[PDB]
Amino acid sequence: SADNTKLDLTPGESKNHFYLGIMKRAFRVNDTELYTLWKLANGGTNPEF
Amino acid sequence: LENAKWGVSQLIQFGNTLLSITERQDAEALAEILQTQGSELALQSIKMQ
Amino acid sequence: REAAVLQKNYLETQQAQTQAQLAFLQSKFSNAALYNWLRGRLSAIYYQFYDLAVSLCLMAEQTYQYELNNAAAHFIKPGAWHGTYAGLLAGETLMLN
Amino acid sequence: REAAVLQKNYLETQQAQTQAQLAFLQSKFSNAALYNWLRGRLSAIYYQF
Amino acid sequence: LTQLISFLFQCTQWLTTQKWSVSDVFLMTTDNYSTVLTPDIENLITTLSNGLSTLSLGDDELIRAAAPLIAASIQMDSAKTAETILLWINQIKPQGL
Amino acid sequence: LTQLISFLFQCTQWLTTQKWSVSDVFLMTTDNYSTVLTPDIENLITTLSNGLSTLSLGDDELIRAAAPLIAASIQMDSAKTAETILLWINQIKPQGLTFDDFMIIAANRDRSENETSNMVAFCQVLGQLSLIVRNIGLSENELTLLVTKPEKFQSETTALQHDLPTLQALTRFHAVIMRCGSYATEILTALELGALTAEQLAVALKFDAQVVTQALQQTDLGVNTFTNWRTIDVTLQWLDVAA
């Protein structure tokens, strides 16, 4: 469910494995790889996901 | 000056000779490694026949 | 089938010929071992002869500084034995100086 | 099929042999880098002389 | 967004036309190089240190005296290509130098 | 028993990867050489006897004066590879002989049978060295790092050995260096120092910086850089298992 739930996309500090595993399966991406995918969309930063 | 000029002309002769010897060294080493690997290919081609 | 047997005999002939070329290159006098010895010996001689000839150059520089009353004349620069390229072009640099 | 597998092994042997010749030419003392240095240094010496 | 898509497409087609990888243009383009001092840099130091004569002046004479030696150090076949490359790097000044 | 089975498997796969026989590593590794005096050894004797000048002193000047002649005798293309190989054989001393006291056994021609036996032992350990360098390929920026700084090889070593596990680790070291490609001497000179980091090994081996530092975090708790080869080997194993 696309809920407005805050989630830290840095590869060690989420511990919300359901949403993050769904993003990894949907985007065909790792932890690190999803994190740099979010850094590209914000100019090398991660404000709040 | 004539004596030092003699010694340095002889050094030039030695450096030219050393360059020729090291390039003939590398040429002969290349010929040897080509023959060894051609021998390997010949054995493998007999096994294919 | 007999054509294929002749082909295998041809390939074994080529194997023996490649081995003959290899044995010729191993056993020739101008093989790679002679050039290994030859450049190692000549490299030792070349470094020691570089020491001798740069000593002769500094000797000529010293009498240049004595005749023309100029003890700060420095024509023979520290260098000219670049060790990574085996000290090649040492005599060209010293003839330049 | 087994003859084709031996052919592929032969081609991989040729690939490794081409890479061995390439690594020999990169790593030899009389490679192109020595001649680059050698003609640049001798070109400087030659103009001053 | 459509400008960035168009840029990525023309850059990717340029890469596959030239048969270069992204790592190739990254090696040719980046600012994220390492700052460790390499024997290539050391060879440049001692070649261009011992090879250049007494102190020369800038783009008039220094760049022409040092272009054969700096084409000797890094892999070039022409000293005049090295001279115009040093003109290029003088007008760009990597980290101010 | 399962450790010996694992050793035999990894050694056999290493042999068939390098395309070496057991006889090849036996020629490169053994102590069961013959002690007979060979014309190669004789050529080494007279070349390095007549070629060296008046008496020079040890690892300061003797090893540098004799490295071109000993690269002339046994098959080498570079005198500096010969110099670091003589440094290696000085710190290992086959049958007690350094390169000092091998010079004294040479240039005698009045020497005893045990004396010439130790001489032949020194010359054939030099031959095992020349093979162990030319069969894997070690271009002396790769080799004098491990001879002079064996702490950069493994943190326990403190003297590079003539073992078979050391030979296999030299193979893996050479393989990762040649895998680094254009950045290889840059990785080597960063490993000379303690400056080999992530964002540098990751670019050279085409990994990601965060994955490389994340595996370095698994082999080392808080070490920022790669200060050793063993940490690079095990962090590449972490990268392989994660990949």
Dihedral through CA C14, CA C19, CA C20, CA C22, nearest 10?
Answer: 130
Cβ burial, residue C13 (10 Å; 0-12/13-18/19+): exposed
Among the listed residues F51, D36, B19, F53, the one whose alpha carbon sits nearest the alpha carbon of residue C90: B19
- Tokens of residue C97, six digits: 């100086």
Q: Return d(Cα F166, Cα F174) in angstroms, integer.
A: 12
- Residue closest to F132 by CA, chosen among F15, F32, F28: F28
Alpha-carbon distances of A21 from A4, A29, F154, rounded to whole Å:
17, 9, 38
Element (H, E) at E5: helix E2-18
End-to-end CA distance of chain D: 68
The shortest CB-CB distance from F141 to any of E27, E36, E39 is to E39
Cβ contact (<8 Å) for D45 and C96?
yes
Contact at CB, F178 and D23, closer than 8 angstroms: yes
Question: What was the resolution (in A) of this experimentally determined structure?
Answer: 2.8
Would you list the DSSP string of A4-33?
A: ------STTS---HHHHHHHHHHHT--HHH
- The Cα–Cα gap between C43 and A23 comes to 65
Chain-centre distance for alpha carbon E29: 10
CA angle F172, F219, F241 (to 5 degrees): 65
Nearest Cα neighbor of F88 from F36, F42, F130, F121 is F130
**Where is E43: in which H helix or E strand?**
helix E39-51
- Residue of chain E whose alpha carbon sits nearest to that of F141: E39
Structure tokens at D34: 């020595």
Tokens of A17: 């494995």
Show which subunits contact E, needing at least 3 CB pairs below 8 angstroms.
C, D, F
Q: Can you tell me the distance from the alpha carbon of F32 to that of F134, in angstroms, rounded to the nearest whole number?
A: 21
- The separation between the first and the last C-alpha atoms of chain A, rounded to the nearest angstrom, is 15
Taking CA–CA distances from C97, the nearest residue in chain E reads E53
Provide φ and ψ at F226, rounded to 5°: -95, 105
End-to-end CA distance of chain F: 30
Angle at F84 between CA F80 and CA F88, to 5 degrees: 160
> Going by C-beta distance under 8 Å and a sequence separation of 6 or more, which residues neighbour residue D18?
none
DSSP string, chain F: -HHHHHHHHHHHHHHHHHT--HHHHHHHH-S-------HHHHHHHHHHHHHS-S---IIIIIHHHHHHHHHHHTT-S-HHHHHHHHHHHHTT-GGG--STTTTTTTT-S---HHHHHHHHHHHHHHHHHHHHHHTT---STTTHHHHH-GGGT-TTTSS----HHHHHHHHHHHHHHHHHGGGHHHHHHHHHTT-B-TTTHHHHTT--HHHHHHHHHHHSSS--SB-SSHHHHHHHHHHHHH-
Torsion of CA A6, A12, A13, A18, to 10 degrees: 50
In angstroms, the CA B29 to CA F193 distance is 35
CB contacts < 8 A, C to F, total 36
DSSP state of C87: T
Residue among F101, F3, F113, F4 at smallest CA distance from F55? F101
Give E51 to chain D, closest Cα distance, Å. Answer: 8
C-alpha distances (whole Å) from E90 to each of E84, F38, F162 are 10, 62, 51
Distance CA E1, CA C28 (A): 70
Q: For chain C, where are the alpha helices, taking DSSP H only?
A: 2-27, 32-67, 90-96
**Terminal-residue alpha carbon distance, chain B:** 72
Phi, psi angle pair for D16, to nearest 5°: -65, -30
- Please choose, from the candidates F41, F36, F35, F18, the residue with its C-alpha nearest in 3D space to the C-alpha of residue F164: F18
Nearest CA among F67, B6, F134, F133 for reference residue C83: F67
> Are the C-beta atoms of A41 and A29 separated by less than 8 Å?
no
Q: What are phi and psi of B39, to 5 degrees?
A: -65, -40
- Written as one letter, the residue type at F118 is N
Residues 6+ apart with CB under 8 A from C59: B3, B4
Phi then psi dihedrals of residue E84, to 5 deg? -75, -25
DSSP 8-state code for residue C30: T
| Burial of residue C24, with CB atoms counted within 10 A of its CB: 0-12 exposed, 13-18 middle, 19 or more buried | exposed
Count other Cβ atoms within 10 Å, centred on residue E96: 4
How far is the CA of F105 from the CAs of F48, F60, F115, in angstroms? 12, 20, 7
What span, in angstroms and rounded, lies between the C-alpha atoms of D11 and D5?
A: 10
Other CB atoms closer than 10 Å to residue A34's CB: what's the count? 19
B46 touches chain D (CB under 8 A): no
As a whole number of angstroms, the distance between CA B16 and CA B9 comes to: 11
Q: Name the neighbours of D, counting chains with at least 3 Cβ pairs within 8 A.
A: B, C, E, F
Bridge partners, F226 (sequence order): F196
Long-range contacts, F181-184 (Cβ 8 Å, 24+): F182/E27
* Nearest partner of F189 among F134, F137, F235, F149, judged by Cα: F149
- Dist CA C53 CA B10 (whole Å): 9
Mutate to test the interface with D, among C36, C42, C89 (most CBs of D within 10 A): C89
- C-alpha triplet E60, E61, E66: angle, nearest 5°: 125
Q: Which helix (H) or strand (E) holds B15?
A: helix B2-48
Cβ contacts of residue F210 below 8 Å, gap of 6+? A11, A32, A35, A36, F198
Maximum distance among all Cα pairs of chain C, rounded to whole angstroms: 95
Query: Which one-letter amino acid corresponds to residue C59?
Result: M
DSSP C77: -
Main-chain phi, psi angles of F196, to 5 degrees:
-85, 110
